[PDB]
Design an enzyme around this catalytic site. Structure first.
Site, mmCIF file in Angstrom:
data_model
loop_
_atom_site.group_PDB
_atom_site.id
_atom_site.type_symbol
_atom_site.label_atom_id
_atom_site.label_comp_id
_atom_site.label_asym_id
_atom_site.label_seq_id
_atom_site.Cartn_x
_atom_site.Cartn_y
_atom_site.Cartn_z
ATOM 1 N N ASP B 194 0.826 -1.190 0.000
ATOM 2 C CA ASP B 194 0.000 0.000 0.000
ATOM 3 C C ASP B 194 0.867 1.250 0.000
ATOM 4 O O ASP B 194 1.480 1.588 1.028
ATOM 5 C CB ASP B 194 -0.934 0.009 1.235
ATOM 6 N N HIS B 276 -8.913 -2.121 -9.219
ATOM 7 C CA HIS B 276 -8.810 -0.943 -8.419
ATOM 8 C C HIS B 276 -7.847 0.099 -8.998
ATOM 9 O O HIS B 276 -8.240 1.226 -9.254
ATOM 10 C CB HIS B 276 -8.355 -1.383 -7.039
HETATM 11 C C1 HEM Z 1 -9.987 -0.465 1.868
HETATM 12 C C2 HEM Z 1 -9.862 0.386 0.849
HETATM 13 C C3 HEM Z 1 -8.737 0.370 -0.092
HETATM 14 C C4 HEM Z 1 -7.731 -0.536 -0.289
HETATM 15 C C5 HEM Z 1 -7.536 -1.843 0.426
HETATM 16 C C6 HEM Z 1 -6.870 -0.018 -1.286
HETATM 17 C C7 HEM Z 1 -5.718 -0.683 -1.741
HETATM 18 C C8 HEM Z 1 -4.900 -0.183 -2.747
HETATM 19 C C9 HEM Z 1 -3.783 -0.837 -3.283
HETATM 20 C C10 HEM Z 1 -3.289 -2.159 -2.834
HETATM 21 C C11 HEM Z 1 -3.224 -0.033 -4.221
HETATM 22 C C12 HEM Z 1 -2.024 -0.347 -5.080
HETATM 23 C C13 HEM Z 1 -0.701 0.091 -4.463
HETATM 24 C C14 HEM Z 1 -0.555 1.585 -4.484
HETATM 25 O O1 HEM Z 1 -0.313 2.174 -5.568
HETATM 26 O O2 HEM Z 1 -0.672 2.210 -3.396
HETATM 27 C C15 HEM Z 1 -4.016 1.131 -4.274
HETATM 28 C C16 HEM Z 1 -3.786 2.166 -5.147
HETATM 29 C C17 HEM Z 1 -4.578 3.274 -5.166
HETATM 30 N N1 HEM Z 1 -5.686 3.539 -4.405
HETATM 31 FE FE1 HEM Z 1 -6.499 2.372 -3.144
HETATM 32 N N2 HEM Z 1 -7.324 1.172 -1.676
HETATM 33 C C18 HEM Z 1 -8.439 1.472 -1.009
HETATM 34 C C19 HEM Z 1 -9.243 2.566 -1.124
HETATM 35 C C20 HEM Z 1 -8.995 3.653 -1.931
HETATM 36 C C21 HEM Z 1 -9.783 4.783 -1.982
HETATM 37 C C22 HEM Z 1 -11.028 4.945 -1.148
HETATM 38 C C23 HEM Z 1 -9.171 5.639 -2.890
HETATM 39 C C24 HEM Z 1 -9.538 6.941 -3.425
HETATM 40 C C25 HEM Z 1 -10.752 7.394 -3.401
HETATM 41 C C26 HEM Z 1 -8.016 4.997 -3.392
HETATM 42 C C27 HEM Z 1 -7.159 5.532 -4.335
HETATM 43 C C28 HEM Z 1 -6.056 4.789 -4.787
HETATM 44 C C29 HEM Z 1 -5.159 5.335 -5.813
HETATM 45 C C30 HEM Z 1 -5.219 6.698 -6.482
HETATM 46 C C31 HEM Z 1 -4.225 4.384 -6.045
HETATM 47 C C32 HEM Z 1 -3.063 4.492 -7.013
HETATM 48 C C33 HEM Z 1 -3.567 4.164 -8.421
HETATM 49 C C34 HEM Z 1 -2.476 4.401 -9.442
HETATM 50 O O3 HEM Z 1 -2.199 5.540 -9.866
HETATM 51 O O4 HEM Z 1 -1.823 3.418 -9.855
HETATM 52 N N3 HEM Z 1 -7.961 3.784 -2.816
HETATM 53 N N4 HEM Z 1 -5.051 1.022 -3.368
#
Ligand code: HEM
Ligand code: HEM
Lengths: 368, 368
Positions: B194, B276
């Site tokens: 994350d 995601h």
């Molecule tokens: C329990 C809720 C969530 C989990 C488990 C989760 C998990 C992850 C994981 C594993 C990644 C990929 C690793 C990384 O680039 O950090 C990621 C990327 C991302 N998450 Fe989440 N996330 C959650 C909720 C959210 C929410 C609510 C938002 C925004 C509204 C969000 C926005 C993003 C963004 C912008 C990325 C990077 C995407 C990219 O540019 O590649 N996430 N998240």
């Protein structure tokens, strides 16, 4: 680098002693984090002794076998995709306990030693029924909270069909990594040094204090060499406690905050009539003695702005009647100065049986 | 000893950077523990703009001044008898934020920048009203939970007369002490790496992503150079998540669990239509970007056996409308694969103003 620095890292770096008796999670160095989980047999299974006893056998076997693995391997060695991948072993340790209510469910009241009799009501009690009791216990400890929660997930899952969580509470102490002196006795949320009067673990008093003496009756002998855990969730009235000046706080307990020395002395290693340590002393309780291995808890704030934080108090002993019970009765009835600042809100007694070669934990009790 | 070992101890050993802008608790290395506390002006004061504004001035001054001390000293330097005595500084850091509801209380809606407009309702919302919003925020972080809770006690006490806790949540990541590699990206309770796609802090994208652009209107300029925090308490359906095999889990996010590499690649540093990371990408959101600095939470079990654990998600940005909002709207409406396994249960937006020489935090807004 320095010796102290290597010492600050040791708890995170090492596996625990999987051979300590009766079970891990009592002797040895205490990891910084704990999760105490009380579980009941699942509702449907629990209805009838026969399905109750089958589900107990399953639960206890799965847990025993998984505690075995978790002592030699980390959660992320046991399963792909665990939350703890990339982390050190962090002294992971697992303890399994059995409540007297389990004996009721499986129609085995014949098997209940006297030491497993329900705890009496105390005059200062303020217990919430949903935070009391339980057919089983898991105590899971680690020096890292991520290692901890990964192991918890696997242990709860291993008996998911057979059991349901009744109550749980996570606690903490200072991390060894952040201790100026990682061998110093840890403090509580009231600022006090907590643990000084425990019997020393390299001393015969430790094993004598902890260990259930042999049972007269072979139906009770499944607890020979085991230990009994009294757990109490004790809320601290910290806002009121902080109104006192340091001298007054020290008078409540009978030891100084800075060094932990009894009042009027210089070293950890005059006292008011109602001081905690006077009323709690074996001296004031016909030699009653216990080993205290408790954790702080911080659960933020509750309705109506009450601070939900405290001591997850845990006392180990051979027999509660010559340990926790007489002592708490003295503190309750004789007006411990500390009573003002604490509320007993959760309570449970668990029998923690001795691990035996070639048998799962409590297999004697279940039989087979 | 070893370089890695010294590195594992650094977060516990050092003070934080008290000069980082807009405030501490955003850039720099993230400590392992966090406590996010939402508070309202006390009930009576809050009734009328004039007493509301006086109590806000007091709260914000006390906090600013105490955050100042806590960045250069430890809680146990500030007061005798603290729970943290004998502990290292553990990167303690304090952040203070202001909710749009504060502006209502003090009759200062004229002062509300467009970026501080309430968050819209999202189609996947499952929010509990008592876990939403708040006039103020405290974010307190440290590498040790005891250092953390000692600092919390002092910060809440400093504004006790003027404020009341509305909701709070403690979170954690792996400790640096227990990381095989303390520079590795931390994982969540779903086992995932994350943080990978956050803009790098040594790169202009970081400050551009985080920082509020100047306001057109001088009544809104109190947030120039500040940042906006969206906090969401997101429960994870871990029991259901654990039924999936590793490949399927990886398909939900679009990155591998072992290494964090996008699917089909080897390094952290093909992807399903509903993955995601595809739906969350700036690419899929007209360049919307945020800095995510979230923590895991473990609150045991709730009624009726529901696992109360999750991600205390925290996104920082210059303007929520070009950050969190469009992105969450895409995830909600476009059917993120992850929606199945999560529930948004708490939400709040805070304006986190830039620290300014010779002024308390938000003194501009209060004036005087
Ligand atoms: C329990 C809720 C969530 C989990 C488990 C989760 C998990 C992850 C994981 C594993 C990644 C990929 C690793 C990384 O680039 O950090 C990621 C990327 C991302 N998450 Fe989440 N996330 C959650 C909720 C959210 C929410 C609510 C938002 C925004 C509204 C969000 C926005 C993003 C963004 C912008 C990325 C990077 C995407 C990219 O540019 O590649 N996430 N998240
Ligand atoms: C929030 C609740 C409590 C707090 C904050 C507290 C705190 C302390 C402190 C600071 C000490 C002195 C240091 C030490 O020797 O460990 C102590 C000693 C002790 N406490 Fe407690 N305690 C609590 C509850 C209890 C309870 C419920 C029991 C038993 C029923 C208990 C039994 C003892 C005993 C036996 C000692 C050692 C007395 C001696 O031999 O000198 N305490 N406690």
């Amino acid at each position: 680098a320095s010796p102290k620095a290597e010492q600050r890292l040791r708890m995170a770096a090492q596996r625990a002693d999987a051979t300590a008796a009766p079970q891990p999670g009592i002797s040895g160095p205490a990891p910084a984090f704990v999760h105490v989980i009380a579980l009941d047999l699942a509702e449907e299974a629990r209805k009838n002794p026969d399905t109750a006893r089958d589900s107990a056998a399953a639960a206890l076997r799965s847990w025993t076998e998984l505690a075995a693995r978790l002592h030699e391997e980390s959660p992320h060695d046991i399963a792909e995709g665990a939350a703890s991948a990339g982390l050190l072993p962090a002294s992971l340790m697992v303890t399994v306990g059995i409540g007297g209510s389990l004996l009721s469910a499986i129609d085995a009241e014949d098997r209940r030693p006297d030491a497993l009799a329900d705890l009496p009501e105390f005059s200062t009690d303020d217990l919430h029924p949903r935070w009391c009791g339980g057919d089983f216990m898991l105590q899971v400890g680690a020096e890292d909270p991520m290692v901890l929660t990964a192991a918890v997930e696997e242990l709860v899952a291993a008996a998911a069909d057979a059991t349901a969580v009744r109550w749980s509470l996570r606690g903490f102490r200072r991390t060894a990594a952040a201790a100026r002196d990682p061998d110093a006795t840890p403090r509580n949320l009231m600022g006090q040094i907590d643990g000084t009067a425990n019997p020393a673990q390299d001393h015969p008093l430790f094993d004598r204090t902890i260990t259930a003496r042999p049972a007269d009756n072979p139906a009770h002998a499944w607890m020979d060499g085991g230990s009994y855990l009294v757990v109490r969730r004790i809320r601290m009235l910290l806002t009121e406690w902080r109104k006192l000046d340091v001298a007054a706080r020290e008078r409540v307990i009978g030891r100084r905050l800075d060094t932990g020395a009894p009042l009027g002395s210089r070293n950890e290693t005059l006292i008011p009539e109602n001081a905690h340590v006077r009323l709690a002393s074996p001296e004031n309780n016909l030699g009653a003695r216990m080993f205290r291995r408790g954790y702080s808890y911080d659960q933020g704030w509750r309705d109506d702005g009450v601070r939900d934080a405290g001591l997850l108090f845990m006392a180990w002993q051979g027999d509660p009647a010559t340990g926790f019970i007489p002592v708490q009765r003295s503190l309750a009835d004789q007006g411990d100065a500390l009573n003002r600042y604490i509320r007993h809100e959760g309570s449970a007694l668990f029998a923690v049986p001795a691990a035996r070669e070639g048998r799962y934990l409590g297999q004697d009790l279940i039989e087979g």
